[PDB]
Amino acid sequence: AISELHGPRLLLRAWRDSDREAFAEMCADPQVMEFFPSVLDRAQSDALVDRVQAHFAERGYGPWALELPGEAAFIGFTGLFDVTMDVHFAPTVEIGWRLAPAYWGRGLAREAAETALDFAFERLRLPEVVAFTTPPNRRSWGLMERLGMRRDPAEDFDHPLLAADHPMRRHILYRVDAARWAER
Numbered sequence: 001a002i003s004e005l006h007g008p009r010l011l012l013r014a015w016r017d018s019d020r021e022a023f024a025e026m027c028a029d030p031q032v033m034e035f036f037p038s039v040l041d042r043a044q045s046d047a048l049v050d051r052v053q054a055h056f057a058e059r060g061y062g063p064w065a066l067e068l069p070g071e072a073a074f075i076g077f078t079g080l081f082d083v084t085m086d087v088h089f090a091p092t093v094e095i096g097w098r099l100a101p102a103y104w105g106r107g108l109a110r111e112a113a114e115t116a117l118d119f120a121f122e123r124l125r126l127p128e129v130v131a132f133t134t135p136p137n138r139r140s141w142g143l144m145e146r147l148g149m150r151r152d153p154a155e156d157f158d159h160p161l162l163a164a165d166h167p168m169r170r171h172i173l174y175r176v177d178a179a180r181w182a183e184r
């Protein structure tokens with residue numbers, strides 16, 4: 001009973017068993033995982049999918065699996081996750097994305113994000129959605145600003161689920177509220 005969402009090219013859907021092999025491939029790809037602490041093995045990949053499925057069961061939304069009808073069953077994920085950790089901007093909802101590298105440079109993460117944010121603001125009627133990443137991950141924060149999200153550098157933060165001296169602790173914060181989304 002999870003609502004599927006449609007874009008011109010994409011289907012945002014609940015995950016299925018068959019997705020885990022392809023997602024595991026992505027999670028083991030160093031180019032996909034470049035700006036994370038490490039690649040994931042199959043157990044870790046599967047544990048992430050378990051958390052995704054749990055979020056969908058609890059909330060009715062989550063990071064949707066991305067299908068490309070006419071092309072491919074699974075190309076990654078894009079969608080919403082509730083922010084509950086001890087950060088200055090909690091509680092809120094974040095958007096995130098991960099695409100297999102063959103699908104980069106096609107506006108597919110852009111389209112998936114637009115579709116997820118339309119859900120956020122039209123259906124859920126959320127006040128705001130945030131996103132966060134590390135400064136080196138230009139492809140990621142680039143997409144955040146192209147969507148119309150905006151960053152205040154004064155809101156940079158250390159990730160509370162990483163060590164206080166973790167090399168990748170420092171994150172940047174983008175925000176988009178309902179009014180700004182509507183004004184695009």
Ligand SMILES: CC(C)(COP(=O)(O)OP(=O)(O)OC[C@H]1O[C@@H](n2cnc3c(N)ncnc32)[C@H](O)[C@@H]1OP(=O)(O)O)[C@@H](O)C(=O)NCCC(=O)NCCS
Pocket residue numbers: 031032033035096097098099100103104105106107108109110111132133134137139140143146
């Ligand atoms: C972050 C990520 C999803 C971005 O994907 P992406 O394909 O670069 O993003 P978009 O969908 O916005 O596509 C943008 C590119 O497509 C091009 N483009 C082509 N057709 C397009 C269209 N119809 N609409 C928009 N852009 C289009 C743009 O010119 C741009 O190219 P460029 O990177 O050479 O400047 C992807 O790089 C990824 O999965 N990275 C690894 C995982 C990760 O780090 N996630 C973030 C953790 S915070």
